[PDB]
Design a binder for these strands. Structure first.
Ligand SMILES: COc1c(NC(=O)c2ccc(NC(=O)c3ccc(NC(=O)[C@H](Cc4c[nH]nn4)NC(=O)c4ccc(NC(=O)c5ccc6cc(O)ccc6c5)cc4)cn3)c(OCCN)c2O)ccc(C(=O)O)c1O
Ligand SMILES: [Mg+2]
Ligand SMILES: [Mg+2]
Lengths: 517, 402, 517, 402
DNA sequence: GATTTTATGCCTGATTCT
DNA sequence: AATCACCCGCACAGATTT
DNA sequence: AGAATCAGGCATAA
DNA sequence: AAATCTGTGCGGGT
């Protein structure tokens, strides 16, 4: 037993909890726009080989694997997180391909884990491109037994296109979706001119683009949010009034509703309002949405005008909603309020880093393969002494020592070996003692082992020529990679080509209409 | 109401526990002392009485059950602390952030609703362990990461470890342990300041000598030190890094502006070093440790490990090999929560009257505690945000350098 | 709207359900005594590599794999089936080694799937012995994607050893456990003499043997059950009366209880009976069973007699129970009532079939390997012409055609082939055109391909000697397999050796005591 | 309470569905015409009223809820079929054996407790599908296995498949389809008589020439015939079994029988082709099919699949290659239960009035139905066992095979 | 993380009719 | 087989008091 | 006094 | 008749 003051315990415990929640659960990362749970789920699904053109898997398998291996928390939260990513009316670009009962726009329910199936989406493979080439770092899991990526090498601007929403201790974040083509055009414009202002970006990006295709009523909140990071906009439904003549009847047909609205709640709220006589001029209400589109029919009395009741509905019910834009994200593990240009710059810097690391890895691999092929080509030109030496040796180890002991003359293959640009295709870790010396070749241990593994099939002419062709191809590839690493302009060309390819592949059309008051 | 009441009817020797979750509650019920102990499991997080109105407190089921179990009244003109049951109260929540949050909620409830109980010192806090180590015969429990690190270091240097430098010296225990402890302290000091400088520069500067500002000059002396540092940094690279340097003068001292580049076409353009850094105590202690840490190893050197000998340089890898030898026959288990532990473990580790460990809760000042509770647990967001920002990592970057 | 008669619907539906339950759910197979769910669980655990000397795995993973792949049914049934096989007080010889909380004899229940782990037991590997050598037939699963064994190639008499219990439509089955050594002795006696009567068998198999070590009362029922296949036996508990002089007051100590009896329910029933003055002379009841063993103490009144109350306890309480032996099993896909001799004969015939198929497979493999070894030896005998011919080869196919269409000189290896004459090692599928004809070897296409895939490493002396040693031992293996297939007594000798080895490995002592009335 | 009522109040245009399982009911409730359709999920198996007593029938929860939902009376002096709600009733159980058992239980309840409901024709049975097949653009549902076989046969012969014998003939559809249908019928006939003969023996006879029992008599050609048959059997044997033949002339027509030693290491006594086998029409149709399946393929032959070609040398190989090519861009989904179907699929398959398919239940004979119910669902075990044994595999030996 | 009563057949004990 | 009752922050109708 | 009828227990499935 | 006050729901956690 030892006394402790209440203030110190309260302070330490609450600060620890707040710091854990701020950077552990809620806020996303600016570079890839994913919370930790999303990253862990995607990595777990990728490790299983659950590709987009293969058979489905049960959700229970993936949820259990994620809980056991990487994410030690409850199963209901993980399953809800998986279910939200497969709904067409929640994400602009879905990241999971689902099968079963995943719910509907009425917000009814979703089937349990043991009644549904899932797999990765085609676009999701762009988020995890070139993951095996040491493009990012890895960190230990909760008990120092596994490795998880620190950040995905994303190729899509995920944060802007898919948006974000999160609640933390002391702060909150809320960012709407966007369109992919406009964002890519803005990124290309930024790359073309690095001192671009907000207006130049907004020429390509008028505003958000929700999945449900509502109407945005206003043009000032978008500018304020994109300039300072905080703003407010109004989303309005789509409706019209039609007259069929005859007896001068008027009916209101509702087609499209705002974002994040449950249709059944709206219908029952309107029914309750007309029951209490709070809205005058409404006779009948019906829903007739069936497999083709959304339609809600409202029949009004003959002693009223449709426009007045429509405006009353817009003012009263949930047909018009207010959306508060508030952009908060982690920059370097610290929350920060940002605007459009900061996000674009962060994405561009991430792409530069990823491409540089990929180039270094590829250069190393090419140099190693060229080093092996040099020894193979040298050995193939001195078959008779090599086979004589191997036959006379009693053991493979003695044969290897005898091969390594003395130098070997280059022979007729000295033309291409000396045509290389000195140290263009020379591995760095290799000592200067080995390699092509003055008129003679010195073999290493692994080169001798590779020679001893050669098959009799390679003595044919075509197999002899293929090695030389591959050697020349590798020399060309090494030259290209060195040229890319040389200047700072080729990197932007590569990035622009990749962005244009992504735009051509995954582009789409606009849904939401922006209009003045 | 999930309450397994005790048999002792005299309210001067009883105990009460508030277990987190259902599995832990069941294990506690299995492993308790049936005479004078009671178990009251809590399924999930409870109401925050600081924000909620007084009406909803009575409606809530969890706090209602707790108030009924305690036996005291609630509300003014009905509270009566004399009529108390279960004079000892213990929290015993998990050892993660959610457990701390639930603990804070319970403390807020007790302090706001029953000041006399907290003042008289009837509320206690338990302390279960985290790690369990087994070494064939020697097995035990270890709490917290710091104790685990201390145990690992002690096992690494549990006898033997005679460092043969040149012919046959012997630190023989205390000197080696003191040196290792100082090196670990300097490593922690380097890690806490890791954000503002690279790791490689700090790890390499300790081997380098002092700056020698006494003989510093605008030419022929300032350049030599930085050139030697850059040479010693360049020849130890594995990630395509490159170190360059430049110097400048401002009529008082010659300041250094080293730069480094790795996996990026950009450049920081400055990692300045001037009179401010050398005047700091951090570099003083770094040089103090580096005075002992020099190239003391001759051509022949080894460590007389137990039936083992590894003659090599780069004493860091020697320490790694020593750690590997220590961990050869060691097994570790990391408890995920109270549900993992079986009833016997819970009985012997936390609920045993003769081998448990606890903490007593007391109040030092009243006005300070009240202000802290109103600031943190109130419903005013801006003071809470300001308080969290003030005690953020910026205030944690303590420049005492000692 | 096509009408349908009620009678035909009822008849077809009920007949389909009854046949499926009879031949797919309840009754076991006589050859191995495993229901389909047990076989599927064991096969699924074997395919995953969950051996008896490896780390554990969670129950949920195995249950999910079983449900997804082979068994299209619920999870509770599968988990209960897995749990019952890991209880020491249910099966005489456990088949699953489990870690966690799998219940207790007092009446507790096992933990959930998420909190326990399992792996295979050592004896289980005997059931699946020689499964990879084409010994049993495979059948399609429900979706026609995977294969499942039709029956395990068992080596343990599982049916008699572990018993069985099942309820079907129109019939039921109930068979008690037995001791392994007695059953093996009976099988050996039957192998020695196939005309042995039931009297001869019963000398080696006195009676059942329960896990809990009760007492069996009477002897007529056992003989009747083993002769006709239906009978009844009485299982009595072990109890005694102890007095420590001094006060001269006795107490009844109970150590053991019958098979499938709950301790808590027995104690509370005894308490209820003695509460209502239905049993006289009982003062106190206590339980002290913990760690060391089982003990139940009953303190009788001072003036009572222990023997009378003890006899009344058997009549009234559950310390004596009645077990009805009724043997029903599937013989050839149809239910049938068995006795001891039929079971023994079926097991012996199954063993004969399995050994014959295994021998055939081994002989085929040996001949196939010896063919390629002969080809490689003949090729190495003439290395220089082979490489000289290959060097002038434009492509591999031309080299292969050149090698195939020409005789070759045997050289110094022909002496070894003198031991291989008489068509001993030639494959049956090989035509007479190929092979040695007049002291000059003839190569086929596959032999030429094997020659072309030869490494330089095998040109050393030791690698040459290894092939000769391999060929020499393969000739002896072929001779042994042919001799095994050539006679019937050798098969019985092999079977007897296997049975004796199993008895030595897994034998143990008896528990239950049989006594007369 | 587990009942979604319909807004229609006229008791002559409503419907009632009795779904199996809770998830299936949840899926069905979303995808239904809310105006005049109601749902009543069943959690599992239900009480058997034939064996139970009336008091227990009243006590049970499922049957009580069903009785309340229907609205009519229960028992004598209370039953009144006129006051009936939901004048249409549909079962819609799963498509496996457990679904059949629950269907039989529901039919027993309806017939025993409400004869007039069944007699007047207010009971229906639904037919949900099993397979869903998509081929890029087309999509369709397939019930059970036979329709899947027909679909596969149609897809295999869908366009192209112009078999070339010598230079370039063209069977062109109908002849090939008839030959394939006859071959499949013969294979189906052969597969159901595995007990009485080996499969390989029956398969081998089709390709060999006809025995011609009319002109055989005692020409002693039976020896050459059986020798050729045994030689052909042993030529391609790949399982270790061996075959021998025995012949005798006990009658004017010489008779022969084979003896086969198989992997079991036991030799069967014989499989004699007596007068019954040669005189049976099975052998006649086998010979008729073999007449069309002689060595029609020339030295070079191939199959002309669409934008593809591959040489072939046997009818079976050509069929296998065609079937393998047909399964290139085909996607098949198999429904394990009603819970695997989203509401749109259920609506368009089973609940749409203008595209659903059902069966109407009617009673033909009263005494026969009563006897059948008493025998099968009664609590007398021996009549049920005798009935199951009579209709067992002993009565499955149908000698028609057509 | 924990949540209901049913079918199918052979033994028993406790209880109810003539 | 989906449902239980609380924490965290922001914006908004209808309900109470000055 | 002795037939007759009613329940609970065991192991794989909704 | 201006100004305080009381509830509901969005998305990851016990
Ligand atoms: C059968 O399925 C299959 C599979 N199967 C699988 O592949 C499968 C594989 C794996 C696992 N699992 C696991 O290995 C595992 C491992 C570890 C755990 N964790 C723990 O032990 C620890 C302990 C612990 C720590 N500290 N204290 N205790 N639990 C917890 O920390 C913990 C977390 C949360 C909670 N409560 C809540 O949140 C909660 C909520 C509401 C509340 C409401 C209230 O009002 C109040 C309170 C509430 C609280 C409490 C404690 C858990 N599981 C698995 O299980 C289910 C995965 N979902 C699998 O199914 C495959 C295929 C098929 C097929 O058909 O092909 C298939 O059918
Ligand atoms: Mg926890
Ligand atoms: Mg089913």
């Amino acid at each position: 037993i030892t006394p402790v003051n209440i203030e110190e315990e309260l302070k330490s415990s609450y600060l620890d909890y707040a710091m854990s929640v701020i950077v552990g659960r809620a806020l996303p990362d600016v570079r890839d726009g994913l919370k930790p749970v999303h990253r862990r789920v995607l990595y777990a699904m990728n490790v299983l080989g659950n590709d987009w053109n293969k058979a489905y898997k049960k959700s229970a398998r993936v949820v259990g694997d994620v809980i056991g291996k990487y994410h030690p928390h409850g199963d209901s939260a993980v399953y809800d997180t998986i279910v939200r990513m497969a709904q067409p009316f929640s994400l602009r670009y879905m990241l999971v391909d689902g099968q079963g009962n995943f719910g509907s726009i009425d917000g009814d329910s979703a089937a349990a884990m043991r009644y549904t199936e899932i797999r990765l989406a085609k676009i999701a493979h762009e988020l995890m491109a070139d993951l095996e080439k040491e493009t990012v770092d890895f960190v230990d899991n909760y008990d120092g037994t596994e490795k998880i990526p620190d950040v995905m090498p994303t190729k899509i601007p995920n944060l802007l296109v898919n948006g974000s929403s999160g609640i933390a201790v002391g702060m909150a974040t809320n960012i709407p979706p966007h369109n992919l083509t406009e964002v890519i055009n803005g990124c290309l414009a930024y790359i073309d001119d690095e001192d671009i202002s907000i207006e130049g970006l907004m020429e390509h990006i008028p505003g958000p683009d929700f999945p449900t295709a509502a109407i945005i009523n206003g043009r000032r909140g978008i500018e304020e949010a994109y300039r300072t990071g905080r703003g407010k906009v109004y989303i309005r439904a789509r409706a019209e009034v039609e007259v069929d003549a005859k007896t001068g009847r008027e009916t209101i047909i509702v087609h499209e509703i705002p974002y994040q609205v449950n249709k059944a709640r709206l219908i029952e709220k309107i029914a309750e309002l007309v029951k209490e006589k709070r809205v005058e001029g409404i006779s009948a209400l019906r829903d007739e949405s069936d497999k083709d589109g959304m339609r809600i029919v409202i029949e009004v009395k003959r002693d009223a005008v449709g426009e007045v009741v429509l405006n009353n509905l817009y003012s009263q019910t949930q047909l018009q909603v207010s959306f508060g834009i508030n952009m908060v994200a982690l920059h370097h593990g610290q929350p920060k309020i940002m605007n459009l240009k900061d996000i674009i710059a962060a994405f561009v810097r991430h792409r530069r880093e990823v491409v540089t690391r990929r180039t270094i890895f590829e250069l190393r691999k090419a140099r190693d393969r060229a080093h092996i092929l040099e020894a193979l080509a040298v050995a193939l030109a001195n078959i008779d002494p090599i086979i004589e030496l191997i036959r006379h040796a009693p053991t493979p180890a003695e044969a290897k020592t005898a091969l390594v002991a003395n130098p070997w003359q280059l022979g007729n293959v000295a033309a291409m070996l000396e045509r290389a640009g000195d140290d263009a295709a020379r591995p760095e870790w290799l000592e200067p003692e080995f390699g092509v010396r003055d008129g003679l070749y010195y073999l290493t241990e692994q080169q001798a082992q590779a020679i001893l593994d050669l098959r009799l099939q390679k003595l044919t002419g075509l197999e002899h020529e293929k090695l030389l062709d591959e050697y020349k191809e590798l020399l060309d590839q090494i030259a290209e990679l060195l040229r890319i690493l040389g200047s700072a302009d080729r990197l932007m060309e590569v990035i622009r080509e990749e962005l244009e390819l992504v735009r051509e592949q995954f582009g789409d059309k606009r849904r939401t209409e922006i209009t003045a008051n | 109401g999930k309450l397994a009441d005790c048999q002792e009817r005299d309210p001067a020797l009883s105990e009460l526990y508030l277990v987190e979750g259902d599995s832990a509650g069941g294990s506690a019920k299995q492993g308790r002392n049936r005479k004078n102990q009671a178990i009251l499991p809590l399924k999930g997080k409870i109401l925050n009485v600081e924000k909620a109105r007084f009406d909803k407190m009575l409606s809530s089921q969890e706090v209602a059950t707790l108030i009924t179990a305690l036996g005291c009244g609630i509300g003014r003109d009905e509270y009566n602390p004399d009529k108390l049951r279960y004079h000892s109260i213990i929290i015993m929540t998990d050892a993660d952030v959610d457990g701390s949050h639930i603990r804070t909620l319970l403390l807020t409830f007790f302090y706001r609703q029953m000041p006399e109980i907290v003042e008289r010192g009837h509320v206690y806090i338990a302390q279960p362990p985290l790690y369990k180590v087994k070494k064939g015969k020697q097995e035990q429990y270890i709490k917290d990461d710091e104790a685990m690190d201390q145990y690992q270091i002690s096992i690494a240097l549990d006898g033997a470890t005679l460092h043969t430098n040149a012919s046959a010296p012997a630190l023989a225990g205390e000197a080696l342990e003191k040196l290792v402890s100082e090196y670990n302290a300097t490593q922690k000091m380097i890690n806490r300041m890791e954000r503002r400088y690279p790791k490689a520069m700090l790890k390499e500067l300790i081997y380098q000598p002092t700056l020698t500002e006494a003989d510093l000059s605008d030419e022929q002396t300032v350049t030599r030190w930085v050139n030697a540092l850059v040479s010693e940094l360049n020849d130890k690279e594995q990630h395509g890094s490159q170190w360059k340097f430049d110097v400048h003068t401002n009529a008082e001292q010659n300041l250094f502006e080293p730069i480094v580049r790795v996996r990026t076409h950009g450049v920081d353009t400055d990692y300045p070093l001037d009179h401010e850094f050398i005047t700091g105590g951090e570099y003083r202690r770094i040089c103090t440790l580096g005075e002992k840490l020099r190239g003391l190893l001759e051509e022949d050197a080894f460590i007389e490990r137990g039936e083992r000998r590894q003659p090599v340089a780069s004493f860091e890898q020697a320490l790694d090999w020593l750690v590997k030898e220590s961990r050869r026959g060691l097994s570790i288990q990391r408890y995920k929560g109270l549900g993992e532990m079986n009833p016997e473990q819970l009985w012997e580790t936390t609920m045993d009257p003769e081998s448990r460990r606890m903490l007593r809760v007391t109040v030092k000042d009243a006005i300070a505690a009240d202000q802290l509770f109103t600031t943190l647990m109130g419903d005013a967001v801006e003071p809470r945000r300001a308080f969290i920002e003030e005690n953020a990592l910026k205030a944690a970057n303590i420049d005492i350098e000692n």
